[PDB]
Amino acid sequence: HHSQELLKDYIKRQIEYYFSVDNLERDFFLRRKMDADGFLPITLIASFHRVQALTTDISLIFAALKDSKVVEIVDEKVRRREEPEKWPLPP
């Protein structure tokens, strides 16, 4: 539906904010959960308050992120496309 495309757009922009440089410079929790290549489980992102308010439908979260030039998906993990390896921190 148009409703579902609109919701996908809000989800997309919310998660793109988490992976923005502006957020990453202060988001020590997110960086501590990255693996050494920058990847995080998409299901971890799904638990964040502003995403979980919008949806609990994991297919909708994946579909929103397929549409993104900010992030890259491999299987069930997601990372910032640009220089992701610079951001991980010790757990």
List alpha helices for the chain, DSSP H: 2-18, 21-24, 28-32, 42-46, 49-54, 58-66
* Residues 6 or more apart in contact with residue 66 via CB below 8 angstroms: 73
Burial annotation 25-36 (CB, 10 A radius, 16+ → b, else e)? eebeebbebbee
**Residues 78, 45: contact at Cβ < 8 Å?**
yes
Strand partners, 79: 72
Number of domains into which the chain is organized: 1
Distance CA 66, CA 20 (A): 17
The domain in which residue 4 lies consists of 1-91
Q: How was this entry determined?
A: X-ray
Pairing of strands 40-41, 77-80: antiparallel
